[PDB]
């Protein structure tokens, strides 16, 4: 079995969430470009090292297990009880790879949609900008994912639940900044949608990975434009300013 990291929303604290995200980042990844860890190169990565599993539980003591691809930290599918569900693969190699996940489940399904936000938002009937994140949302998403396996969850609710999980797990692993946003929500017992600073970072993760690894001794060939909390645009010209912001990058050749 692939490595498993457990998290529960029941009695969750800033510390327990912090420990969780640190453990996830630890199973995902020392190999650093300009001070920032790089995820493993897909080329040369054996299939038995391709995925990690995140098992989420809630107050209702329901559990689901998400499968993340270590090459990009992103969710590819999940297991609930005797069933597993996978986003539609982009290519034949990826489709073959996911056959290695959850091999003992009785029922396997592939969705007719991929796991990218632009599509998930359409299916959810809401933009990320209007979907609350926090411990409450995560608790509800876990129940929704679980009940999708028994018929009790409609597609829009499922898609919304994926959007919640991906941001609170994958994007938090990718960015200390987003991890900090989730910690703040936990600390003050709040639920709220991500602001433009978060959305733009999420959207820019691939571009930042490329800019950082292609940089000239840390300096960007061309500036990357991000947004502040209030939506105003600013430019980043250097890797150094991003060190406290981005935790992991996709490997670039």
């Amino acid at each position: 079995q692939y490595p498993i990291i457990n998290f529960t929303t029941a009695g969750a604290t800033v510390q327990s969430y912090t420990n969780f995200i640190r453990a996830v980042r630890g199973r995902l990844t020392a190999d650093v470009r300009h001070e920032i860890p790089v995820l493993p190169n897909r080329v040369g990565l054996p299939i038995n090292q391709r995925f990690i599993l995140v098992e989420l539980s809630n107050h209702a003591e329901l559990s689901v297990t998400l499968a993340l691809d270590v090459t990009n930290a992103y969710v590819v599918g999940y297991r609930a009880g005797n069933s597993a569900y996978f986003f539609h693969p982009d290519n034949q190699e990826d489709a073959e790879a996911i056959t290695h996940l959850f091999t003992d489940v009785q029922n396997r399904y592939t969705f007719a949609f991929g796991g990218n936000y632009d599509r998930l938002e359409q299916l959810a009937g809401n933009l990320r900008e209007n979907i609350e994140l926090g411990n409450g949302p995560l608790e509800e998403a876990i129940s929704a994912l679980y009940y999708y396996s028994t018929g009790g969850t409609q597609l829009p609710t499922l898609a919304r639940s994926f959007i919640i999980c991906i941001q609170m797990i994958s994007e938090a692993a990718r960015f200390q900044y987003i991890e900090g946003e989730m910690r703040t929500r936990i600390r003050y017992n709040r639920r709220s949608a991500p602001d433009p600073s978060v959305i733009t970072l999420e959207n820019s993760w691939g571009r930042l990975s490329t800019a950082i690894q292609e940089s000239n001794q840390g300096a960007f060939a061309s500036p990357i434009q991000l947004q502040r909390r209030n939506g105003s645009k600013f430019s980043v010209y250097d890797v150094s300013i991003l060190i406290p912001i981005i935790a992991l990058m996709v490997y670039r050749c």
Partner: nanobody
Amino acid sequence: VQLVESGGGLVQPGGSLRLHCAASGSIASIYRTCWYRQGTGKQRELVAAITSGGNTYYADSVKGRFTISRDNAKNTIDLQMNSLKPEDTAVYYCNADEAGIGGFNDYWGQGTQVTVSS
């Protein structure tokens, strides 16, 4: 795919009904088949569901009393309703929903009235 419900009616509290839904086409590959209900002046709510794999879901309000069944050869979906209560009064709808597996088609029946009353 057309869905046609039947078997609704009036019962006294404690009575039983069995709702029937006939699909005009194959439901074998349709992920979710469900019963929803809508009371007067309220929003439609999920009552029970069964997947193409045979897993089931029941709303808290009906657990123990209702049983959903599904026949993938005859293309029918049934709801056995026991120990009925006035609170169960509503229009019941059958739903066949691909739910993002294989496609996005979502079929609804026209609904049938259930009334539990003295």
